[PDB]
Amino acid sequence: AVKYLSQEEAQAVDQELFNEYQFSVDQLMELAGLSCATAIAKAYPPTSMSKSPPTVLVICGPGNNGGDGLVCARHLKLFGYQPTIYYPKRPNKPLFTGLVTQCQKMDIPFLGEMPPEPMMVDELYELVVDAIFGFSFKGDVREPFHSILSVLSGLTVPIASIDIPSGWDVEKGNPSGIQPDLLISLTAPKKSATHFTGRYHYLGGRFVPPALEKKYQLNLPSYPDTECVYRLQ
Amino acid sequence: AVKYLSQEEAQAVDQELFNEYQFSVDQLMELAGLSCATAIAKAYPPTSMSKSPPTVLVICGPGNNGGDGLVCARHLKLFGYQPTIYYPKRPNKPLFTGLVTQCQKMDIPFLGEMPPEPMMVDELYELVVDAIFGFSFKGDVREPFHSILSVLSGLTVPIASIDIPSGWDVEKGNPSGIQPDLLISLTAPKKSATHFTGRYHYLGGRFVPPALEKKYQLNLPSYPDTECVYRLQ
Numbered sequence: 001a002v003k004y005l006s007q008e009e010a011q012a013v014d015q016e017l018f019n020e021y022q023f024s025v026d027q028l029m030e031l032a033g034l035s036c037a038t039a040i041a042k043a044y045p046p047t048s049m050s051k052s053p054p055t056v057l058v059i060c061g062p063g064n065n066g067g068d069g070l071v072c073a074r075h076l077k078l079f080g081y082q083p084t085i086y087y088p089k090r091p092n093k094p095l096f097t098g099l100v101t102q103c104q105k106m107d108i109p110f111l112g113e114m115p116p117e118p119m120m121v122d123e124l125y126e127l128v129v130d131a132i133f134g135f136s137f138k139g140d141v142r143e144p145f146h147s148i149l150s151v152l153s154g155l156t157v158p159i160a161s162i163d164i165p166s167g168w169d170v171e172k173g174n175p176s177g178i179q180p181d182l183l184i185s186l187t188a189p190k191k192s193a194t195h196f197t198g199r200y201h202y203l204g205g206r207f208v209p210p211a212l213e214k215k216y217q218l219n220l221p222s223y224p225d226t227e228c229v230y231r232l233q
Numbered sequence: 234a235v236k237y238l239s240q241e242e243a244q245a246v247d248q249e250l251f252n253e254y255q256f257s258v259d260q261l262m263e264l265a266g267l268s269c270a271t272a273i274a275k276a277y278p279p280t281s282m283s284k285s286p287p288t289v290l291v292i293c294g295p296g297n298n299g300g301d302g303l304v305c306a307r308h309l310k311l312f313g314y315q316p317t318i319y320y321p322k323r324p325n326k327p328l329f330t331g332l333v334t335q336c337q338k339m340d341i342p343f344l345g346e347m348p349p350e351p352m353m354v355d356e357l358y359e360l361v362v363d364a365i366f367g368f369s370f371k372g373d374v375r376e377p378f379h380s381i382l383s384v385l386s387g388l389t390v391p392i393a394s395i396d397i398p399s400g401w402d403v404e405k406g407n408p409s410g411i412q413p414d415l416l417i418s419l420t421a422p423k424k425s426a427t428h429f430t431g432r433y434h435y436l437g438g439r440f441v442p443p444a445l446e447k448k449y450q451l452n453l454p455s456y457p458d459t460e461c462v463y464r465l466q
């Protein structure tokens with residue numbers, strides 16, 4: 001059975017990957033994002049949806065989890081979804097500006113504003129992807145994300161959170177916060193994932209050197225054949 | 234660190250103030266209310282709000298917390314907010330009838346009915362003030378407040394609760410009840426305030442004789458200079 005990283009182990013693994021193994025950020029972010037998109041398409045496949053193409057709102061935060069979201073959105077389009085992105089706070093680095101351009105050019109719209117009522121989110125978007133905050137946030141929830149998360153917690157449509165449910169604490173979680181229906185753990189699950197109560201928990205980020213896995217006793221399962229996602233239980 | 238009163242200590246402090254120190258109710262309620270309005274303006278200052286003047290719905294209960302709410306509302310108006318009040322159950326005592334007249338004459342509207350859906354509350358009112366029940370309720374939530382609280386718990390806009398979040402138990406709290414974004418503890422925090430998870434917790438009711446403070450080991454911080462509120466952490 002698979003380990004659940006503490007916030008410190010997770011930073012170690014991350015630091016290793018970028019420093020020992022010398023993976024660049026682009027690379028892991030591409031694979032992370034592809035893995036999110038893939039998990040979303042396995043859990044909420046387009047044929048199972050009422051609209052066609054199915055609609056998805058991807059809300060990207062101000063760091064890496066956001067970057068993951070942009071990558072996720074772009075692959076979602078190619079999997080036959082109709083994504084829309086809301087990216088209120090964008091770092092001015094070409095990683096992020098490249099991601100925005102890539103999505104613009106694939107006719108993926110960036111909204112000027114978050115629809116202000118849950119019901120409106122629900123009628124426009126069959127699925128919302130929470131790419132707001134990742135593991136390394138501590139935090140604390142400054143606007144406009146407080147207000148965003150407050151809308152999210154009133155939705156009726158499912159939420160899919162990347163790595164961690166934004167607003168939860170990475171180890172202890174949050175009973176009063178958002179309650180995703182899908183969680184996509186990247187690399188390995190974090191401790192907060194124990195408090196997870198949605199239907200689907202997938203593991204993604206299949207780029208773990210088997211040495212690293214062993215060094216931190218991750219007990220990652222065997223991803224089947226050519227798959228970049230595994231559904232945990 | 235500041236103490237958190239039990240429900241019995243709080244009744245003692247209160248009884249003292251009105252009996253030993255011989256503060257009248259008018260007096261402390263004026264200061265309490267001013268303090269609430271002030272904390273609201275520090276946490277949600279008008280310039281930070283999308284509407285101008287910013288709108289606020291103040292829901293007043295059937296006792297003192299309600300009284301606090303009416304005072305709060307009247308000072309909010311003078312701070313440049315556009316308050317509206319909902320006061321379904323009004324004691325026929327001139328304290329309360331004076332408060333109502335004061336607000337009426339400042340063109341503060343009292344609604345005939347609570348807007349029945351959260352979404353409607355959200356579109357009309359940028360902030361809602363919960364002045365329904367204070368510490369000395371036990372309770373139990375009779376209509377129309379059950380239904381009111383049920384709407385409040387679906388809002389997207391922030392709630393500011395005066396002294397205690399109505400519907401919580403004063404010492405143990407309530408996971409299934411409303412979740413204010415601002416709590417204004419009066420005099421000193423009550424035990425329920427430990428379960429508080431909103432962004433802002435202010436301390437108000439700066440009228441504590443330093444003797445009383447000492448007698449109950451309150452450890453009230455030093456309110457800065459001329460301030461009637463201190464933000465706790």
Ligand SMILES: [Cl-]
Pocket residue numbers: 141142143
């Ligand atoms: Cl902020």
Ligand SMILES: [Cl-]
Pocket residue numbers: 374375376
């Ligand atoms: Cl009743």
